[PDB]
Amino acid sequence: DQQLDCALDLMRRLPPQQIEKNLSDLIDLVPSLCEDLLSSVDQPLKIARDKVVGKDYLLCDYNRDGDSYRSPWSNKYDPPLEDGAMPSARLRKLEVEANNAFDQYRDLYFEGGVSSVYLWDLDHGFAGVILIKKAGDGSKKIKGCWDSIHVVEVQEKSSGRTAHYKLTSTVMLWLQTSGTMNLGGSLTRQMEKDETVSDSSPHIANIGRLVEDMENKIRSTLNEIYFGKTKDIVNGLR
């Protein structure tokens, strides 16, 4: 009834530092909510090795089937799976292109880190997740990490000359060191827009521009909230 609501609200309050443990304990508390919780609660991104191509890729609920995850490079599951969820032949071609575009995007903005893009078919369009993970180098005795999770939905139209894009974007930003000091968590923003779909403005360029606009905005809001607002709140305690 109100259980799913209460669970999501509860994850907005429990310390983000223990997201993975708290989500698993939450699902044990209410097992009937497992599927909705795994697809709705953002979790820190994990890195896996695709041994066939010798490339790292990122794990999340969107590339999971059972206990296996799908590589965007080889399009195979690890551990192997015979009955695994797959993009349609045509969408997979678009997924390969998207991975190569956002790998360049990643290099341009993050100058390192790892990226992965997974697409899936919908009845009148498609959806995708764009993932970026970049760890801090540990300088100045501070450990950092940045996780981007961009979920986009594309609703295609009759003209083929216009589509409706819906973007839900989360950045998880993790910082920790006198004594102990841990400043972490995430921000989520949404936006939706119509865009022209053309030979000169294809889906991936439209998505790319929406993600870049959104992530530039979120980087600036993270700066404001983390290092402005929460510091201000601390100083208002004393």
Partner: peptide, 17 residues
């Protein structure tokens, strides 16, 4: 707000399934 797109019905993790 609005909802994220949902994915096809897939196998749950071995623990809860």
């Amino acid at each position: 707000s609005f909802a994220k797109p949902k994915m096809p019905g897939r196998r749950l993790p071995g623990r809860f399934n």
